[PDB]
């Protein structure tokens, strides 16, 4: 009874089922603030029941607890009137399991919403590892004033901007937000076939850029010159004329003036660095407001751009058949050389692997180039890939070029993993054949099995690490030590 996961210690002493708790599916609230959450009316009414009872007795409506409970269960308008004010200043801890790091529990100030699903801020998703494909979250209600103060000053999501692992921001825009910001801050150059309105115009401030953009006289991606404040070589803010885009000006209307002027196309890496810099110069509240504003801007302009996924964006290179035929001819020549007796079996196998790898690399590069120069860099798939919103070179190559060479389904007893000589010449727009799909299912299932079976090891490692590091707490201020460690740059391959 005392031993194991189900034992007394690990089931009833180190972790307990708790009161004033709830659980429900999570939907996305994009119009909320970083420190807000949407609680369904029934969930809030059940969680905050003693507080509603206190207000009901104080108001003189009832004098006993049972009558107040009956009134609450009848779902009267007075209950909601009380609960609206009861909610204020009383945050709730949202938790998504597994709780790998401390950001898995975060305090949110709740608001009453319709429906039965918790509304969660999108920027918190990365902290929770939470998507909206069926995920569920748990709500815990602090009771004492010290617990509420801890929630408001240590757990509030607007305070959990930085990752404790490395110090870099964790509340960074992702997916639609990054795609919209990238679309707004990317430059477009005027050509005779497609003119860009308002190119080369000089503006006295961001005010005139806003006026011209609102009157539809300068395009969002037009290259303009604007007089704004920027650092000089000495670090002082001085007015200067910068060549930028309209979208960059609009993005900088919400960037704090202490961070200077940002004149770069916004991807995930640049956004992370920019949020870190703004937090370095300003404080947390300013960074939170900046995050909310740029979230709204990115969502708005991704929505306005109509960015889709069409088969026209998956431009299969016209040269694919030529490269495949040339590689087939090379493989035929290598096969002849092995047949009549110049190269060994291993040499022929290695040469075939080499030629197919080179052909796959060239095809991937050509698909990269085509998708990059399509629509002057405004291909939606390319914007998703280059902004960091979603995608990679491998997936796009599987969509446009070829799936490449696949590892053989050899057992662990067999030494090493060979590569099938015939690669998957087809991609997912053309359509894999029966044999190619059967080949791919082995790798897919191996990856899924690794995912589903090799997180118990991660949990065990985390448990052992926590138990060996539990007692390490900053207890004093100075250990009066003359000892230390030498730190130098970390160089790999010089």
């Amino acid at each position: 009874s005392l031993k194991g996961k189900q034992g007394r210690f690990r089931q009833n002493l180190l972790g307990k089922r708790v009161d004033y708790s709830a659980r429900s599916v999570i939907v996305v609230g994009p119009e909320m603030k970083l420190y807000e959450c949407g609680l369904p009316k029934d969930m809030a009414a059940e969680l905050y029941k003693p507080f509603i009872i206190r207000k009901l007795i104080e108001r003189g409506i009832v004098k006993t607890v049972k009558s107040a409970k009956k009134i609450i269960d009848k779902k009267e308008p007075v209950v909601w009137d009380i609960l609206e004010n009861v909610l204020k200043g009383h945050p709730v801890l949202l938790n998504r399991a597994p709780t790998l790091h401390r950001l898995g529990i975060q305090a949110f100030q709740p608001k009453l919403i319709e429906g039965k699903a918790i509304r969660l801020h999108p920027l918190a998703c990365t902290a929770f590892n939470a998507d909206f494909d069926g995920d569920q979250m748990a709500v815990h209600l602090p009771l004492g004033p010290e617990a509420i103060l801890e929630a408001q000053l240590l757990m509030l999501a607007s305070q959990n901007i930085l990752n404790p692992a490395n110090g870099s921001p964790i509340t960074v825009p992702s997916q639609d937000m990054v795609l919209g910001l990238y679309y707004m801050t990317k430059e477009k150059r005027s050509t005779p076939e497609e003119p860009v309105i308002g190119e080369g115009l000089t503006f006295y401030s961001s005010e005139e850029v806003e006026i011209a953009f609102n009157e539809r006289k300068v395009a969002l991606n037009a290259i303009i010159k604007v007089r704004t404040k920027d650092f000089n070589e000495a670090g002082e803010l001085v007015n200067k004329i910068i060549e930028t885009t309209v979208g960059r000006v609009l993005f900088n209307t919400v960037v704090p003036e202490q961070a200077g002027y940002i004149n770069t196309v916004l991807n995930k890496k640049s956004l992370r660095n920019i949020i870190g810099d703004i937090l370095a110069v300003t404080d947390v509240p300013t960074t939170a407001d900046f995050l909310d504003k740029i979230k709204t801007m990115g969502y708005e302009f991704a929505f306005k751009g109509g960015l889709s996924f069409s088969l026209g964006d998956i431009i299969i290179p016209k040269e694919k058949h030529e490269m495949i035929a040339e590689a087939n001819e090379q493989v035929d020549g290598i096969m002849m050389n092995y047949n009549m007796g110049l190269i060994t079996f291993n040499e022929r196998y290695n040469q075939v692997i080499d030629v197919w790898t080179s052909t796959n690399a060239m095809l991937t590069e050509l698909a990269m180039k085509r998708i990059r120069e399509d629509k002057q860099g405004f291909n939606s798939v390319y914007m998703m890939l280059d902004s960091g919103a979603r995608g990679s070179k491998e997936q796009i190559r599987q969509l446009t070029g070829m799936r490449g060479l696949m590892a053989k389904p050899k057992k662990s007893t067999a030494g090493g993993g060979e590569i099938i000589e015939n690669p998957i010449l087809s991609n997912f727009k053309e359509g894999l054949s029966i044999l190619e799909y059967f080949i791919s299912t082995h790798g897919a299932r191996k990856g899924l099995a690794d995912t589903a079976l090799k997180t118990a090891d991660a949990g065990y490692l985390t448990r052992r690490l926590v138990d060996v590091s539990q007692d390490v707490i900053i207890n004093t201020e100075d250990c009066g030590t003359l000892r230390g460690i030498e730190v130098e740059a970390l160089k790999k391959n010089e």
Binding site: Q6, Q11, N12, R17
Partner: protein, 87 residues
Amino acid sequence: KFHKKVNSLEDYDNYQDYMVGYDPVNDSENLDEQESTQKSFDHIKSILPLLNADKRHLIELCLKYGFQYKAISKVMGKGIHETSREI
């Protein structure tokens, strides 16, 4: 047979989580019912001195030995029938 008709709670996984449960509302309601019964009995005890002395002692004896018409009748002098009628 009775001991072999009894299963083991270990046959249900995590039986301590979702089984063997109770609600304190039932306990509070039971104690409230007990208090109501006690108040009724106190009301009856307060009414008792207002009755005739013989009928008060009949009830007092009937509350410390208990509707024992025979032993009360020999104690009193009245018969079983008379004592029952007076009670």
